[PDB]
């Protein structure tokens, strides 16, 4: 339960398969809903139970309420701390694009990684998590663009 970035694994399929990634901060585990579907998780010999989740936001927290509240400033480059399946954590710097919606604009990162990279954190220059990578769209040119998905800290 040390703060940091974690892989989310399963042994249900062939061998050990990485289905996603998440962030441990202030004793709470944060990931995207589509990675765990709200199922409980194991951390060593201990169990982490879901605490909050929302399919539409595509987010879920374990052991406590969503803690991540930093926001992209709309101007600066950010870093995707990509944790790909079977590969070392790697920082990728990029200038986000925008998703324009009827309910407001959201930052978006145009980087393509395996599905099991979902839940990797996007950071600002202070190292704060401004959202999670992995819920997005496939555009005309076939490129994948992820929203910068951030929850609300109650």
């Amino acid at each position: 339960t040390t703060d940091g970035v974690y892989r989310v694994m399963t042994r249900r399929l062939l061998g050990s398969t990485q289905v996603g990634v998440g962030v441990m901060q202030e004793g709470v585990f944060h990931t995207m809903w589509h990675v765990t579907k709200g199922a409980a998780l194991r951390s060593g010999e201990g169990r982490l139970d879901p605490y909050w989740g929302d399919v539409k936001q595509d987010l879920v927290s374990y052991c406590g309420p969503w803690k991540l509240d930093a926001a992209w400033d709309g101007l600066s480059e950010v870093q995707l701390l990509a944790v790909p399946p079977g590969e070392r954590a790697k920082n990728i710097q990029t200038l986000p694009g925008i998703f324009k919606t009827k309910d407001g604009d959201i930052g978006a990162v145009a980087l393509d990684y395996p599905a099991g990279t979902s839940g990797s954190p996007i950071l600002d220059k202070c190292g704060r998590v401004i959202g999670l990578y992995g819920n997005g769209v496939v555009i005309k040119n076939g490129s994948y663009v992820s929203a910068i998905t951030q929850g609300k800290r109650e």
Binding site: V8, S43, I92, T94, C126
Partner: protein, 38 residues
């Protein structure tokens, strides 16, 4: 049964590899959490 494994610290890396473009897209978000192009 799903389990977690530590992969690293969350820090900004000075002089990290810089890539990706910045597309400005009109999108819609449905009740199932799926984004689509408008």
């Amino acid at each position: 049964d799903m389990y977690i494994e530590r992969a690293g610290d969350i820090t900004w890396e000075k002089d990290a590899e810089v890539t990706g473009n910045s597309p400005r897209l009109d999108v819609a978000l449905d009740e199932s959490g799926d984004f689509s192009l408008v």
